[PDB]
Amino acid sequence: NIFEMLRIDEGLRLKIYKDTEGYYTIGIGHLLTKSPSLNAAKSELDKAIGRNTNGVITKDEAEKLFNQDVDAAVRGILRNAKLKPVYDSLDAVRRAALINMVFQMGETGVAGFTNSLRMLQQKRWDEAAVNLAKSRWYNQTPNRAKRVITTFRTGTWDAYAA
Amino acid sequence: DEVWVVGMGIVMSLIVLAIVFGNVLVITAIAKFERLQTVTNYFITSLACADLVMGLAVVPFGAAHILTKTWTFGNFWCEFWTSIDVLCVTASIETLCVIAVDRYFAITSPFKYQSLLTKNKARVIILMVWIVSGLTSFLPIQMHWYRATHQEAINCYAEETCCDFFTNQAYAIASSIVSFYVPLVIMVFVYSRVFQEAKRQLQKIDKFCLKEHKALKTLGIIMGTFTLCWLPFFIVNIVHVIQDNLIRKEVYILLNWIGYVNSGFNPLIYCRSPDFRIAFQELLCL
Numbered sequence: 476n477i478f479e480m481l482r483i484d485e486g487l488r489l490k491i492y493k494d495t496e497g498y499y500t501i502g503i504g505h506l507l508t509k510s511p512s513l514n515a516a517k518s519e520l521d522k523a524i525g526r527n528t529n530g531v532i533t534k535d536e537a538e539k540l541f542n543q544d545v546d547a548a549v550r551g552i553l554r555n556a557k558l559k560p561v562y563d564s565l566d567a568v569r570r571a572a573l574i575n576m577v578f579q580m581g582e583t584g585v586a587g588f589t590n591s592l593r594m595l596q597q598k599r600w601d602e603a604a605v606n607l608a609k610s611r612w613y614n615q616t617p618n619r620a621k622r623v624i625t626t627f628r629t630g631t632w633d634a635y636a637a
Numbered sequence: 638d639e640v641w642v643v644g645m646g647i648v649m650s651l652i653v654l655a656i657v658f659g660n661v662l663v664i665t666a667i668a669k670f671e672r673l674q675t676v677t678n679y680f681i682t683s684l685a686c687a688d689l690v691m692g693l694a695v696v697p698f699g700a701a702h703i704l705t706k707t708w709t710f711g712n713f714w715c716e717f718w719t720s721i722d723v724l725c726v727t728a729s730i731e732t733l734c735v736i737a738v739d740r741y742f743a744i745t746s747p748f749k750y751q752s753l754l755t756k757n758k759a760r761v762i763i764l765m766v767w768i769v770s771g772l773t774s775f776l777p778i779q780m781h782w783y784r785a786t787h788q789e790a791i792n793c794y795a796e797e798t799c800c801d802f803f804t805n806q807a808y809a810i811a812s813s814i815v816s817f818y819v820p821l822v823i824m825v826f827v828y829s830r831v832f833q834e835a836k837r838q839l840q841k842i843d844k845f846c847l848k849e850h851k852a853l854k855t856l857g858i859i860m861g862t863f864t865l866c867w868l869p870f871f872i873v874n875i876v877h878v879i880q881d882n883l884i885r886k887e888v889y890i891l892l893n894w895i896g897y898v899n900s901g902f903n904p905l906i907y908c909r910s911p912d913f914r915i916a917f918q919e920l921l922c923l
């Protein structure tokens with residue numbers, strides 16, 4: 476399912492680390508905070524967790540946080556007036572692809588593509604893919620972009636599992 | 638492809654069952670029957686133990702890794718697993734080498750075809766084999782001496798869902814030479830001399846049983862097989878040390894798995910011996 480998708484694309488790390496932006500991140504794609512300070516990240520983390528983690532957390536915990544982030548993700552996608560119509564017209568699969576794009580690029584970032592969303596809502600896949608392939612997101616991470624896009628056109632998990 | 642993953646699941650399940658079944662058979666036959674108890678079959682017992690640990694501990698998790706296209710067992714068990722793997726292979730080659738040497742010193746002693754070592758010496762030798770094997774496998778792996786310094790390998794190490802073996806050129810070369818090549822050359826030379834001797838005898842006057850020469854042919858078969866299975870793999874290691882990525886990962890994995898499949902060939906090779914055959918058919922209620 477979707478959890479598997481994200482679990483693959485982003486990846487899962489047991490110990491605190493800095494992401495591609497240099498910000499503090501742990502578990503699957505969970506942002507502790509944006510700051511060079513490890514102490515601020517520790518505060519954020521402990522606030523998200525039950526007790527002091529020192530920066531090390533259990534797989535289970537990581538999954539808990541991932542769930543919180545997915546919840547918050549879905550809520551965000553629903554509240555956004557631009558994204559809402561598109562997400563409602565997409566089947567569970569493409570919905571998952573979308574939730575992926577929102578995990579990586581965030582609400583605003585995803586709302587960045589007007590025509591992509593427009594056609595996704597119009598059930599026109601190929602053209603949409605052609606639009607997403609010329610994007611910045613695709614250029615930055617051509618692998619995840621290619622997989623997600625392929626997921627949009629195919630509407631299947633065949634891109635993440637053979 | 639779920640259809641593909643199931644097919645592979647069935648194939649590799651048949652593989653694992655074959656390995657476990659066979660080596661278990663060998664060990665049981667060797668341990669139960671007093672007629673089958675000799676230094677040679679003690680070494681064979683060590684070998685079948687190595688291949689057994691290969692069957693239960695390693696192959697299944699590798700299969701799971703390839704099928705699921707990812708590692709679900711966590712870094713800890715990834716590392717320990719690799720340790721188990723290298724340990725097994727090393728112990729195996731060392732065992733075969735020891736066997737070769739034993740046969741050499743046994744054929745050529747004034748009393749011929751007789752091996753000078755009693756039982757408690759053999760056990761000691763095996764124990765030492767496993768000790769130095771785990772010494773050249775676990776230590777380097779548990780001390781993280783193999784680990785590469787590039788960002789890819791580091792990401793794969795810190796990643797719990799990623800199990801991949803990345804080795805700095807140094808570890809690749811050193812470990813592949815010490816754990817494989819040297820004892821290989823040793824075995825080859827020694828056993829070649831053993832065949833030369835066997836031929837210098839068989840043409841000589843009576844009497845020395847042919848069954849023993851057939852046995853030398855059998856052992857020769859075990860060794861030949863092992864070397865032929867693992868050779869392509871250990872060659873490619875040095876290949877990637879010289880020029881890396883000159884060979885596809887898939888191919889690497891393939892040769893790797895050839896080496897794996899080798900672990901189940903021994904039980905079928907021991908059938909050459911009338912003794913092991915009678916024993917086998919005995920345990921099977923035939």
Ligand SMILES: CC(C)NC[C@H](O)COc1cccc2[nH]c3ccccc3c12
Pocket residue numbers: 719722723724726727802804808809810812813816817874893896
């Ligand atoms: C798929 C992995 C985890 N298993 C690798 C090979 O089966 C055997 O590995 C070895 C056994 C003995 C000595 C060795 N030296 C090496 C150097 C590089 C890679 C593997 C080995 C190796």
